[PDB]
Amino acid sequence: TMSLGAENSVAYSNNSIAIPTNFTISVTTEILPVSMTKTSVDCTMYICGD
Amino acid sequence: KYFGGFNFSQILPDPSKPSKRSPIEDLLFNKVT
């Protein structure tokens, strides 16, 4: 059975806050299609080949 | 579940059923066939 992920229990309280002290600049990537292969068909040659 | 005074008893999952869903979600599954 596939696991959805690890279990983490945030210690929620009324007077408990977590402020980060350091930072980690990360560079991610995202691939997005933009164009497509422009095609054109010949009705005569395809249907009636020679 | 003392979140300052807000009652999330209808949004958080309910452990008194084998589906472990919230009371609002229970209404949704019993409404869409």
| A14 touches B: beta carbon within 8 Å | yes
Exposed, middle or buried: residue B23 (CB in 10 Å: 0-12, 13-18, 19+)?
middle
CB B18 within 8 A of CB B26: no
Q: d(Cα A7, Cα A16) in Å, to the nearest integer?
A: 20
Token duo for residue B5: 């005074």
DSSP track, A1-50: -------------SS---------------------------HHHHHS--
Measured in angstroms, the CA of A23 and the nearest CA of chain B are apart by 29
For residue A21, count other CB atoms closer than 10 A to its CB: 5
Resolution, in Å, please? 3.2
| A22 touches B: beta carbon within 8 Å | no
Note the helical H segments in chain B.
Answer: 23-29
DSSP letter assigned to residue B24: H
Token duo for residue A48: 């009636």
CB A8 within 8 A of CB A18: no
Residues 6+ apart with CB under 8 A from A10: none
